[PDB]
Amino acid sequence: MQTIKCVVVGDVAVGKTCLLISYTTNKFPSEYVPTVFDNYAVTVMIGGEPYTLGLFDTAGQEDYDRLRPLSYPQTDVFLVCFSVVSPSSFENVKEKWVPEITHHCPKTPFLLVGTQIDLRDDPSTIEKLAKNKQKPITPETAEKLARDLKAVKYVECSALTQKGLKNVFDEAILAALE
């Protein structure tokens, strides 16, 4: 019937799988297992009619760079994820992920998704970043990159606390349907 295919990409350990499992099942994964590929599906009512939202979970690992794009055909919307407390992941949105998805799927919309926002005001995390003179990514900085890369929208969330989490998918859904 009606379907939306959403593919989620981004650096290793930015939180793609936690985002998906937390959203689709309201549980938080209890151990980190690197993803190769996983495929989830839920139903969402949109103006009172059911859509199947297919969520494709992909490897952040570079060794899956040649296999990953085999999952891309007929994608309706991408989530390009970076952790707001990992500057390297944010740089790779520009240097790796948006170039990759737009090469394969030039007409397909994507959202820039900042993850792990609960750690933005976490003293231990800030301390850890400050060791290497790093700083978290601010919303203003992310919005600027989203505009420059022609993302539909920048959204952010915490899979752990679920703050912003439903809104991420609401915006992905609307982007797929616009």
Binding site: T3, K5, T17, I21, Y23, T24, T25, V33, T35, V36, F37, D38, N39, Y40, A41, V42, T43, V44, M45, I46, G47, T52, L53, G54, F56, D57, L67, L70, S71, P73, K166, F169, D170, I173, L174
Partner: peptide, 29 residues
């Protein structure tokens, strides 16, 4: 209220996967 989207409802039929990726799936699925 026209762009309101419900909470997700579990256990829908997963969308088709390219057959060659089938073996690379799971266990998280």
């Amino acid at each position: 209220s026209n762009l309101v989207i419900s909470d997700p409802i579990p256990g829908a039929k997963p969308l088709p996967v390219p057959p060659e990726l089938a073996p690379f799936v799971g266990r998280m699925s």
